[PDB]
Ligand binder design. Sequence first.
Ligand SMILES: [Zn+2]
Ligand SMILES: [Zn+2]
Lengths: 50, 105, 353, 42, 304
Amino acid sequence: NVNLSREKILNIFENYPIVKKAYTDNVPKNFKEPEFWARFFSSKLFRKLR
Amino acid sequence: MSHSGAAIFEKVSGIIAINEDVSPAELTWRSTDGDKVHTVVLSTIDKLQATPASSEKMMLRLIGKVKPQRHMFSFNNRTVMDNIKMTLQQIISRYKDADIYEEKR
Amino acid sequence: QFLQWCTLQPENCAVFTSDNKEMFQTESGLVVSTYSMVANTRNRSHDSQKVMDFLTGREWGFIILDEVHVVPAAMFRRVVSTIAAHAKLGLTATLVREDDKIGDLNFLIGPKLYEANWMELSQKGHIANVQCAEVWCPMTAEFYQEYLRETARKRMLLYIMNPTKFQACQFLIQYHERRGDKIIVFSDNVYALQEYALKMGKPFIYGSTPQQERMNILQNFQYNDQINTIFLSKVGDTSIDLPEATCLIQISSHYGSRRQEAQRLGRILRAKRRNDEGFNAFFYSLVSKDTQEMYYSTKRQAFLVDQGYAFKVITHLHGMENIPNLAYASPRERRELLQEVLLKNHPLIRKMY
Amino acid sequence: PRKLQDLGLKPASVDPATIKRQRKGKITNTHMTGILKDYSHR
Amino acid sequence: DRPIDDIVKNLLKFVVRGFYGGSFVLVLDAILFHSVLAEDDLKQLLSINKTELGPLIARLRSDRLISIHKQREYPPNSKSVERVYYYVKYPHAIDAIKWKVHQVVQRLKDDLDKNSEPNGYMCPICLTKYTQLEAVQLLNFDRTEFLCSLCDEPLVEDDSGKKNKEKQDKLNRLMDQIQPIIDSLKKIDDSRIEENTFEIALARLIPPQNQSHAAYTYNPKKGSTMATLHINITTASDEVAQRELQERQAEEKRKQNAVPEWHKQSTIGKTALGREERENEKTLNDYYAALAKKQALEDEFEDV
Ligand SMILES: [Zn+2]
Ligand SMILES: [Zn+2]
């Protein structure tokens, strides 16, 4: 389990604009915030950005 | 290869495919001769029952939410078992998290 | 420990026990055996006699006498003669005996090379910081009258089996189980061990218990969170493997055995939680008041106060009346317990045979 | 798979399997039969 | 899928289309499409009689383009038979292709070399050959004609050497036709192939028919010696509550490590142990509106 606060996820938002672009076209159209973050944290993009 | 496999559904052979790009996610079982197509929408899935590798006959049970809905997928190879169960476990974990957090919100 | 900490090969290491009797084939190496096997003056087996011939015929460079306090015994003494070793190191924690033969180790092994300062090790955190306490249990009138009108062997069991020590031990078990402590309750009397264990619902280990049951109970004590208390007889004093324990309750003892007292303290001196700030292990010696157990307890603690430990006397446990299930609180059950304690003491001809 | 390298070619196959391949004792603690648990692993 | 699997699939397809007939092409293409395939599966797809697939399967096994598995299962109707599974072993198959085409080139060289020694002679009456080395033991007294040892007939000329250019042309026509084979062999020898078996080949199966009596589940035998990610999104207001909960857990740790009373303080003097905001926010809203106007079957279970 990991803890994700609003200031934390906003910090992902400015330091990685690619995650912001992933948010914008996905969370009001296809699927929601917690499953989106689960997909991103299971994706290779999280490893490559880390 | 990870999202496709061969399985037996209701003692009838067919192909299991994972439609993950569509929202909500689906498991489609297609009859090979074109007799029937069964679909599972993954939002209304509660729990998964599996069997250990020491067991001979391989069953995969899907239990949904409301009398609960029960689905049976008989499998053939342990790699198909492994990749199907890990993809299914990840997506039902995501859907359970989404349902829990929407209930909390 | 040899094979783990040092670069000694298993082909260079050998074991002389009952099951294992094969020796190392190299020109030098390690053999580990027991005092009884080495000093067995009984008619030993042929292969063990061959191993003893090998040990005697070799000139050994170093001998490690673990628990050297048993070396001054009757024929454990001769293991330093039958084995011609150039260097002799006796390693111990309890360098006391209840006879005056402990000073013979200066002639057997050698002078007292090193003594550890136990308080310095405790404040450096190498061993656990133990709170030693002596809990005074006032006997009931009936048990004290029966204690006065009996001989010493019945007197021992009768001051061990008093209901006040039942109540104090049960209260301490409940309190330290709420505090989340692994508790060992030591009692040499086997009948008292069994009665306390059946009264308190905690497992007991003594001499006649099977080895598989002992291992299962010890594993449950180490890992199961519902098993936080084990009752141990004198099997726990000798060098057997025990799980990590932080609380110890001594119900009975073997007279004034300072060696057994410090051996019991050593079973909680090595607790894993030493790195935690504010952690303290607990030693309790539950003794019946106005008996010879007080005399024997002071005699046992005389060695531990030489190491620097202070035994705080506890004449009152706060909460002894608020405990819901108190053992032997009713006078009729006390009388029943008194009654149990008092009533404790040519091939064809072979078919015929 | 072991003669292609004798003939000089690279063998894409490994050599097959033909060539070179291989209680319950008494319980004294009768008052907690079922409270203690078995531990076959650490 | 995997590029080397594509190359070996095209190599097997090319060799079965070149050196084998159309029914062989159909059977091996079915094997390459559906990874494992039982006899009833071949019958259902190809409508081929058992006696018709006989020579087909026999040739494919004798060239090891396909291999057989003799596994029998236990169907629910208990009418079990020792059915046979047909699949492809890629490394043994490609090694067989290399060995076959290599030694075919080798004895084509042998045949053209045997043509390249001079022709010799043969006797038409007795239909026996006699090379130039032993014809000179059979020449006549007139020193003009070679006479046969049995027929006593003048030896006639053979044609081992007149056809050397024809054999060279046939070799060339073989080589330019089998150029794709050698290119595929070069690629699969440059790259690395996985040694597949029946158990590996079950992983990428596309099933052939619905009411299949063949069950693809493997049955191991004894004695034959032949994770998840969970997150916690919060609105940064319950994070204070979570810090409070961790602080809480710190004071239960403090009572875990707390010193008891009978150890902290002396027990001698004690007895012996024995038996309104809504409406003013409405006024703020009204004042803000006024200001804005102013600007305006049960089995084993596992938890997975
Ligand atoms: Zn062999
Ligand atoms: Zn002739």
